Write a protein that binds this ligand. Structure first.
Ligand code: ZN
Ligand code: ZN
Lengths: 197, 195
């Protein structure tokens, strides 16, 4: 057992996802063993990141400015909007180092259990961007779980009346996977979505 | 003991059995009741002597013509190519495929000791010789092996004019953008379908 001020660190660190007890203890001692200025850096980086967070006025992504870097990039293709559930999906998609389009961040999915409706996530503003803008394609890239799929599907009906091309990211068997260890639901999509040549 | 040493040799020849595991299995085995090791030994050869290969699809079942190829609706004009008998039960568990199969028993891996005549390719072409099949579905694994094998069977199948398709690569159901490898994600993106 540890002094209170250390128990307090350990407890605060253990609240973070993927940080168990032993891992928290370790980190606490490492931290309180770092030079005071290094621990000041950590501590301030934490507080400042939270304080400085803003949501882009165009796509709602996490940013520092009024309009995020991506939206203000002009040789980036504003006629294609990749719709995503969360800020960190934008990073995942952005790391695919193809894709010159822009983004729309919903901040969630439709979810009757969580009690989240379409009016509780950034859907209407997606509509408005498509209504008021010159949009060639909306790529629905929510997750392929039930709610990500319900959400992409809700959005798709909505955008129908506009004459936009709306696509959904390919479900299937992941690269490097094997048929044996693939759930039956994915096999089904892999088969059903098979493609020529 | 030379008899144990040979057991150990025979065991570690097998896939998934490392040197230590062969040895531990070897001792367990020589400790089993005689009638249990007889049974193990018997099961080994009996499965080799009784095994079949379907006359149409080359799957191992205990029928000369397997129950799928025999089934009257099953659609012989569409053939789903997989590597392994376990793959057939995988695909079947989806309670959705209508066509029939072609089991290769393996893939083409230079780095393992297997080539395009160590597996059941020529016999697949023969099925596609008379022009009576529409699509061959290529459903080898989306790994290195699987993919080689498939993009090749596909050249061979090019004549014959049949329609050849490939099991769709992408993000699996239940998966999420955060934990999907870039390669898979890039495929999910560049293969997106109009909803
Ligand atoms: Zn933005
Ligand atoms: Zn058969």
């Amino acid at each position: 057992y540890y002094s209170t001020s250390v128990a307090k660190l350990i407890e605060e660190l253990s609240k973070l996802p993927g940080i168990g007890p032993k891992t928290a203890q370790r980190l606490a001692f490492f931290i309180i063993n770092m030079p005071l200025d290094e621990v000041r850096s950590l501590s301030q980086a934490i507080i400042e990141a939270k304080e400085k967070l803003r949501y882009c006025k165009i796509c709602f992504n996490i940013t520092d400015k009024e309009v995020c870097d991506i939206c203000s990039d002009e040789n980036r293709d504003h006629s294609t909007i990749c719709v995503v559930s969360h800020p960190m999906d934008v990073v995942a998609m952005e790391k695919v180092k193809e894709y010159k389009g822009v983004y729309h961040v919903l901040h969630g999915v439709i979810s009757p259990i969580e009690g989240v409706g379409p009016e509780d996530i950034r859907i209407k503003e997606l509509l408005e961007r498509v209504r008021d803008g010159s949009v060639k394609e909306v790529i629905l890239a929510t997750n392929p779980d039930i709610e990500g799929e319900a959400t992409a599907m809700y959005i798709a009906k909505l955008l129908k009346p506009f004459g936009v091309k709306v696509t959904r990211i390919a479900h299937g068997i992941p690269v490097g996977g094997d048929l044996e260890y693939t759930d039956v639901v994915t096999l089904s999509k892999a088969l059903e979505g098979r493609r020529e040549v």
